[PDB]
Amino acid sequence: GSSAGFDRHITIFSPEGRLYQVEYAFKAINQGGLTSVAVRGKDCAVIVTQKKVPDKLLDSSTVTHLFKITENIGCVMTGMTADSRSQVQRARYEAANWKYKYGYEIPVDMLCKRIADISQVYTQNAEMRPLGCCMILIGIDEEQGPQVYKCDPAGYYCGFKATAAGVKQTESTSFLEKKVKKKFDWTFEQTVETAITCLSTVLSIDFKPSEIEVGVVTVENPKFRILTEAEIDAHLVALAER
Amino acid sequence: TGYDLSASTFSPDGRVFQVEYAMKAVENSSTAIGIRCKDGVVFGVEKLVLSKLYEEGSNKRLFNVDRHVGMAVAGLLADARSLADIAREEASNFRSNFGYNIPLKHLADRVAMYVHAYTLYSAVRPFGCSFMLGSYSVNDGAQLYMIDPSGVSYGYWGCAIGKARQAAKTEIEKLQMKEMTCRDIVKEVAKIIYIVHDEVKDKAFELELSWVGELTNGRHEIVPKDIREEAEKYAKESLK
Amino acid sequence: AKDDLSGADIKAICTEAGLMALRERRMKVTNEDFKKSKENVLYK
Amino acid sequence: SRRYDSRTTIFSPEGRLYQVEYAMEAIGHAGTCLGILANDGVLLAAERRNIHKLLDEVFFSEKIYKLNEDMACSVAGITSDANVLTNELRLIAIPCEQLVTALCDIKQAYTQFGGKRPFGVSLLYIGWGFQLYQSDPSGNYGGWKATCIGNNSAAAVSMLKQDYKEGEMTLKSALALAIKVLNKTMDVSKLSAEKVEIATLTRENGKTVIRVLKQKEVEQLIKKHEEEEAKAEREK
Amino acid sequence: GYSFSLTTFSPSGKLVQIEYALAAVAGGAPSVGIKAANGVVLATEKKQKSILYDERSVHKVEPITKHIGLVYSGMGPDYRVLVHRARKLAQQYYLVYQEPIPTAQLVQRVASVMQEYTQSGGVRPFGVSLLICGWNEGRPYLFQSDPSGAYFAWKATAMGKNYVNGKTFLEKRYNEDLELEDAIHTAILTLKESFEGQMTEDNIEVGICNEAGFRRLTPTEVKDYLAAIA
Amino acid sequence: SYDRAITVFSPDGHLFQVEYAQEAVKKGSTAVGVRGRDIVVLGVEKKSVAKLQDERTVRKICALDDNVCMAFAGLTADARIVINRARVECQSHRLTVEDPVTVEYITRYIASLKQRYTQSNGRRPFGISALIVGFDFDGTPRLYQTDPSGTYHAWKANAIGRGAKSVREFLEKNYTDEAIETDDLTIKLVIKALLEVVQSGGKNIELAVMRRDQSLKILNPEEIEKYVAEIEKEKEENE
Amino acid sequence: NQYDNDVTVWSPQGRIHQIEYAMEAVKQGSATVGLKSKTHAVLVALKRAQSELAAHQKKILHVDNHIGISIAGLTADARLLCNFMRQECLDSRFVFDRPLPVSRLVSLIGSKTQIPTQRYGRRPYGVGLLIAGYDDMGPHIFQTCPSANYFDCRAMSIGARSQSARTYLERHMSEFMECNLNELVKHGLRALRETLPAEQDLTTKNVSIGIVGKDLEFTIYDDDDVSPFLEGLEERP
Amino acid sequence: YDRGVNTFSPEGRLFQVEYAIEAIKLGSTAIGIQTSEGVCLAVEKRITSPLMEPSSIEKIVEIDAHIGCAMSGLIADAKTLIDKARVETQNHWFTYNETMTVESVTQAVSNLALQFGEEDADPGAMSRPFGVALLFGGVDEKGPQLFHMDPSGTFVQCDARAIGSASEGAQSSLQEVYHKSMTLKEAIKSSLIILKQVMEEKLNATNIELATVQPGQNFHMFTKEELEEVIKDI
């Protein structure tokens, strides 16, 4: 962990080849205290995150980390709330610009690849800080099917069958790793159930249908929709009864 | 230590301290509360007079960023004023492009992104003011959004910004705001501000009241003096 | 010998020149000894 | 902004430009580049530091670059910065000194305004009369009859100061001087043809011929020098 | 943005920031390139920390043209910036000359971009090394572009973690008469010494260039090559 | 655009970058200029004359115009920018006024250009001092000196470089109407001045003379060697 | 410290020291008193001379026919602000052909002076202004701070030793509203007298008065023209 | 250093402005006296070598035929200020066909001070204050007028102001010798007595500069013969 000069204050290399400022942006994902989980099934993709409303004074309808980037693409934001909105607005602009310039809906892989490209410039130029947020896109592709892509502060991005970002990312990764090892092409109900279970088992909350937001995309309806409290209750009831 | 002198520098714990220091400027200002009732939003600002030499109306913390949106501020007043014109120019551009009054959710999201844009680079400093935007319309309904120096905008039923924000929030919680109207709430907003005011500490405050609702036809305006004085008497009586 | 010549370099040339003469079992220092002296202290 | 500014283009309290000197220190750790002017031609002898056995040989030359039909240059220092200067040297092209002055104006500009680090490259220029030039990161250029830049440049100049017969030098004598100077400068006692890079500029038929000597030709010079040095051993 | 260079000369005459960028290259996943008689092979260790990652989603061996391919060792995001620049530079070459860009030209153009971030204001050097492979004039080409902007023509080289040992492994295992298939075998063997765990068809990425052009070997093809190792 | 204040006031009120630029002047070759009756003599000491160095390229005396020439002391690369900028202005002045530039004008332009670099963002001061000599249209010999600060003064005789103080002290004692009665005596004066700091002798002296209605004439080493013999000869009879 | 070198550096206490340091520039300036009545708003300034062979520095500047200001701080910065407010007042005449409202003009200079207090490398306008004006809404006295925060004051005093004047202004505040023009100026002169040392007194050389009223244009009074105002007020106890 | 050019001290002082004021104290002494019969401007040339031509040291400049300036501090810096004063004048004449008032000339030059900064500035913007103090003296509608400018942009009318290394001593001497109703010839003499007492060298007609702007008459630099006439007294 050697240091030499301003390698801790601006995005320049350390003596061992480390960008500490970029690493510090990763710790900002845990500043919000929320965990997001995304699971991809055979014909659906689900993003689930916990919602916290500390007081009844706050309008719970406005606390949403699930954002409809496009009619067919939705994302869950974890990290700094202010930086998360900036990425969502940028992602919406790029999705709209892609449709205008190219004539077809932006692929999920290309949407974060641009966002990862946008966030990489922050990791090379020293005049701006990396956005302390993590973006997980889900969407149904025309051919590749369901897609899940995480989009880190450093510009790293990858496809995921089941990913998670936030405070409990590593504990939820192990749970999802265990489930995917079983090699089951989950249906829509199983994928929501394993998404809710992963957040529930790691946080140990036994969710009510007001503490988690669930957003799904399915092959039959390739549109991003926010599950209503009643709809989330159906999965919570089904999970409990088994 | 050098980790808190720029907004483009993250702390090793992943926290931008320059933004957090701007949060402290808001917590050093007087308390402004806003309550979203059944048929509108009512704003109340505890406006201390720093001297008797100031005229009644100086340092107005209640702005009109649009004909249907108000703004209650706390923190650096110069930054609060600057963010007022940004909201005014955002609302003006929205009407000049799309042809209708700017939704408060979009107005809050647009100004907050301007606030957030000053939290990323060392060439600018974060705005040292937190403000609440309240609006009412027949279609969208009463909305109350609060934007902080970091750039975070959440909707609220009742919010407080200032040094007695915690104390005022407890008083707001006792209210049944979702059922009572603006007429019943202006008295309550007056009562809460008087409760949280510290007479032994900085004293001689002025009650600044404003509202937007169906009784103003979706237009933000200062509460008329007759109703404002009536609420003031009720607020003073509640202190026994 | 060099533009930025110091007294230490001047003395080092001499003692090395004498050391070169000592190697060849000589008491008289020749110009070749000084030539090989400069290439030892100033260079390499 | 001011905190992270290293202030490259400022004066030291003693009146020097530290970035310029620190750049000149980089050339000292770079490959040895030789240049000797003769009456019928001028040569650039460059030490090759990319002497790994797995390094493919595809380019015409490694450190010696052709600027135009009449001029050639060899670089010592940061190779990436050299590529920038060689491209701009070609774009500027022309008389030899005019080309050298034009690039040194670019190099001096980075040491006066802009806040950027200087180009850590020293160049030896050869062209057609016959003339040899040397440039420094400070933007200071000078014409030479025989000069060296890079590792053991001072040692190489010292032997040139003694063995370079002014006016009475041909290509064969100058080429022989290049091998002899490079022998002491390089730490290798043999100086194989794979670690040395020689290019000659000569006027044939009223046209300038810039040619990089093949490995077979160079081995002859290394051989001829070693027997000649062995001949001097016969005297003692 | 900042208008002052973040890379400066140390008192010892070294661009210290460039050396630190090369330290990031030495920490990247190993990348091996071999120029055989009839082609060039590019191989890398595309190993994920969990199965949840989709291996085929992001590729480390990315084509630039129909005949030029890239493999890196260093920072993943920085490689994509250079991939886009290489493709843009390859196109800008193609519109003017109406001819596929030569391999040596693209490396020079790409290495110039890398040098800029070592001199430009307010930017840090790219923390990757690029192994450029191509086919022009009926001859295979292999180049390496360091973070400083220096480009080297390699008959066979290894980058990334344990690159020093991999380079010596190639010295004793590479000959100019080697064929492309034996190059792939030698490339996988070069990766194997630095590899930890077992090499499946998904945790390594192999790309080859020949007269037919550059293509990235599918995981099925790499499985056949891998079977010959054991 | 690099927009930063390099030259700023010290708390005492000094511009330290200007002083440091004047410190680089003190590390350069000694340049000596003497304003005679009908001749102007510029003398520059040569640093470590190398038998392998082309003396034509490293020349500290350059002609801005046909009637104005200058010798510098300091950073060689810095000077070449000033000479080229001054040369372009000499032709611009001649294009507009249709009259050859005066020595006062081009020493004013160089000084103004030098001063601009002590008050402009991102630019370090020029680390050279200029000894501008020449003739006006009316035949009056003029000698001017600039420093990195931007101050230009006219001198009967002056020296810049490392040994400026010693040569100037020598010049204040030996510059008299008798010493500039003839051109030969004026040329001897600069050599006498430069012999005070040049240790080896005339091999490290570069001499350039300009006469009225004539171009700049660089003195060949044989001509200089002829003069040093005369000074050496005149030394004996004075003993 | 490390939190006082730039205007974009927040102190850990939520304060900007460069803004605060610029606020001290006003406190180094000479005292000026601004008070208003039902129909008039006059400015009283105490001019300072570096040496007795030099003129006393002008403090009241004419911005428009209906708006006038008194400066306290950096004179060149005051000129920069006054030139901006002179142009804005002139611009309003060119477009709307009406006097620029005083409250509306101070808002422009409050937004103009806030920009330098938030960008890197810029500095706050180290000048304090006391704006006196008349419009459709009546007389106004505005105080402008280097912090870009302006106050609508009924009677204000800024400068060196201005707090003594504020004490006088607070005490006799109630009688400002209904007193005539002569009594209003004497109140300001009496207020400005509290800033002086004991041995010093208000003279024609060090007093400048600027008056704007309902039917009276903004006129600045000087040494000859201030004597009709000084002679009435009695000697201080 | 860490501090920028536009940085405020804890006492409200612009650091660079205060530093530029200290630069005047290293400059040559200049004495300016305003009289009913005209304005007087004197400055010491401060010759450092007999080989330096005294005439080349121009520390009093013709701003216009009716106004001149005496400079002290960094002489190279005042050239930029003098040039605009010679440009702003002849711009007033171009637009209004009249000679610009001495106060307005000093006002225009004063605006250049504080037009310096690091960031958010034009490419031609300055980086540091003008480390020079100017003594404008001329004749206009208001008669003879003397104005003093400092690197802070602060200009003020002065009856008799002394700037330079000996500003403190000469100003004290000026106060003891200046009365409002005195002739210009007395002003020329009185300024020369004070200069001779503060100069390092012995006062003569070659190491000083005298200029006068009388009403009616134009700006007039004193020649060697004219200076020797008043030097011969004291």
From Swiss-Prot, chain A:
**Phosphotyrosine: residues carrying this PTM:** Y156
Give the primary localization class: cytoplasm
Question: Gene3D superfamilies recorded for this chain?
Answer: Glutamine Phosphoribosylpyrophosphate, subunit 1, domain 1
Point out the glycosylated residues in this chain: S2
Q: Which GO terms describe its molecular function?
A: endopeptidase activity; NF-kappaB binding; purine ribonucleoside triphosphate binding; RNA binding
Identify the GO cellular component terms for this protein. Answer: cilium; cytoplasm; cytosol; extracellular exosome; mitochondrion; myofibril; nuclear matrix; nucleoplasm
Please give the superkingdom of this protein's source.
Answer: Eukaryota
Annotated positions of the N6-acetyllysine modification: K99, K101
Known InterPro entries for this protein?
Ntn_hydrolases_N (IPR029055), Proteasome_alpha (IPR050115), Proteasome_alpha-type (IPR023332), Proteasome_asu_N (IPR000426), Proteasome_sua/b (IPR001353), Proteasome_subunit_alpha6 (IPR034642)
Q: Which residues carry this modification: Phosphoserine?
A: S14, S60, S61
Kindly indicate whether the keyword Lyase belongs to this entry: no
Location of the protein in the cell: Cytoplasm; Nucleus
Q: Which GO BP terms sit in this record?
A: positive regulation of canonical NF-kappaB signal transduction; proteasome-mediated ubiquitin-dependent protein catabolic process; proteolysis involved in protein catabolic process; regulation of inflammatory response
Q: Which CDD domains match?
A: proteasome_alpha_type_6 (cd03754)
Q: What UniProt keywords are attached to this protein's entry?
A: Acetylation, Cytoplasm, Glycoprotein, Nucleus, Phosphoprotein, Proteasome
Which Pfam families does the entry link to? Proteasome, Proteasome_A_N
Q: Does the keyword Iron apply?
A: no
Q: Which family does it belong to?
A: Belongs to the peptidase T1A family.
**Name of the featured protein:** Proteasome subunit alpha type-6
Q: Which organism is it from?
A: Homo sapiens (Human)
Q: Which gene encodes it?
A: PSMA6
From Swiss-Prot, chain B:
Pfam families per record: Proteasome, Proteasome_A_N
GO BP, one annotated term: proteasome-mediated ubiquitin-dependent protein catabolic process
Query: So which domain of life are we looking at?
Result: Eukaryota
Q: Which UniProt keywords apply?
A: Acetylation, Cytoplasm, Host-virus interaction, Nucleus, Phosphoprotein, Proteasome
Q: What triggers expression?
A: Down-regulated by antioxidants BO-653 and probucol. Up-regulated by bacterial lipopolysaccharides (LPS) and TNF.
Main localization of the protein described in the UniProt heading: cytoplasm
Question: Which GO cellular component term is one of those annotated?
Answer: proteasome complex
For the keyword Cytoplasm, the answer is yes
**Record localization:** Cytoplasm; Nucleus
InterPro entries per the record? Ntn_hydrolases_N (IPR029055), Proteasome_alpha (IPR050115), Proteasome_alpha-type (IPR023332), Proteasome_asu_N (IPR000426), Proteasome_sua/b (IPR001353)
Q: Which residues carry this modification: Phosphoserine?
A: S238
What is an example of a GO molecular function annotated in this UniProt entry? ubiquitin protein ligase binding
Give the N6-acetyllysine positions (modified residues). K52, K201, K225
Summarize the protein's role: Component of the 20S core proteasome complex involved in the proteolytic degradation of most intracellular proteins. This complex plays numerous essential roles within the cell by associating with different regulatory particles. Associated with two 19S regulatory particles, forms the 26S proteasome and thus participates in the ATP-dependent degradation of ubiquitinated proteins.
Family classification? Belongs to the peptidase T1A family.
Q: Which PANTHER family match?
A: PROTEASOME SUBUNIT ALPHA/BETA
This chain belongs to the protein called Proteasome subunit alpha type-3
> What's the source species for this entry?
Homo sapiens
Give the organism's phylogenetic lineage. Answer: Eukaryota, Metazoa, Chordata, Craniata, Vertebrata
What gene codes for this chain?
A: PSMA3
Curated annotation (Swiss-Prot), chain G:
Task: Write down the PROSITE patterns for this protein, in alphabetical order.
Answer: PROTEASOME_ALPHA_1, PROTEASOME_ALPHA_2
Q: Where in the cell is it found?
A: Cytoplasm; Nucleus
Attached carbohydrates are found at S107
CDD domains cross-referenced by the UniProt entry: proteasome_alpha_type_1 (cd03749)
Q: Which GO terms describe its molecular function?
A: lipopolysaccharide binding
Q: Where is this cross-link: Glycyl lysine isopeptide (Lys-Gly) (interchain with G-Cter in ubiquitin)?
A: K112, K205
- Keywords assigned by UniProt, alphabetized: Acetylation, Cytoplasm, Glycoprotein, Immunity, Isopeptide bond, Nucleus, Phosphoprotein, Proteasome, Ubl conjugation
Gene Ontology biological process terms from the UniProt entry: immune system process; negative regulation of inflammatory response to antigenic stimulus; proteasome-mediated ubiquitin-dependent protein catabolic process
Induction and repression of expression: Induced in breast cancer tissue (at protein level). Up-regulated in liver tumor tissues.
Question: Chief subcellular site?
Answer: cytoplasm
Entry-annotated residues carrying Phosphoserine: S107, S174
The record's listing under Pfam families reads:
Proteasome, Proteasome_A_N
- Assigned GO CC terms: centrosome; cytoplasm; cytosol; extracellular exosome; nucleoplasm; nucleus; proteasome complex; proteasome core complex
Which family does the UniProt entry place this protein in? Belongs to the peptidase T1A family.
In UniProt terms, what function does this protein have? Answer: Component of the 20S core proteasome complex involved in the proteolytic degradation of most intracellular proteins. This complex plays numerous essential roles within the cell by associating with different regulatory particles. Associated with two 19S regulatory particles, forms the 26S proteasome and thus participates in the ATP-dependent degradation of ubiquitinated proteins.
Q: What is this protein called?
A: Proteasome subunit alpha type-1
What organism does this protein naturally occur in?
Answer: Homo sapiens (Human)
Classification of source organism: Eukaryota, Metazoa, Chordata, Craniata, Vertebrata
Curated annotation (Swiss-Prot), chain H:
SUPFAM superfamilies in the cross-refs: N-terminal nucleophile aminohydrolases (Ntn hydrolases)
Which gene name belongs to this protein?
A: PSMA5
Its tissue distribution reads: Expressed in fetal brain (at protein level).
As for family, the record states: Belongs to the peptidase T1A family.
- What is the protein named? Proteasome subunit alpha type-5
Cytoplasm in keyword set: yes
Alphabetically list the UniProt keywords.
Acetylation, Cytoplasm, Glycoprotein, Nucleus, Phosphoprotein, Proteasome
Which residues bear sugar attachments? S191
Q: Would you tell me the Gene Ontology cellular component terms?
A: cytoplasm; cytosol; extracellular exosome; extracellular region; ficolin-1-rich granule lumen; nucleoplasm; nucleus; proteasome complex
- Up-regulation conditions: Up-regulated in colon cancer cell lines. Up-regulated in fetal Down syndrome (DS) brain (at protein level). May be the target of the transcriptional activator NFE2L2.
From the broadest rank down, the organism's phylogenetic lineage runs: Eukaryota, Metazoa, Chordata, Craniata, Vertebrata
Localisation:
Cytoplasm; Nucleus
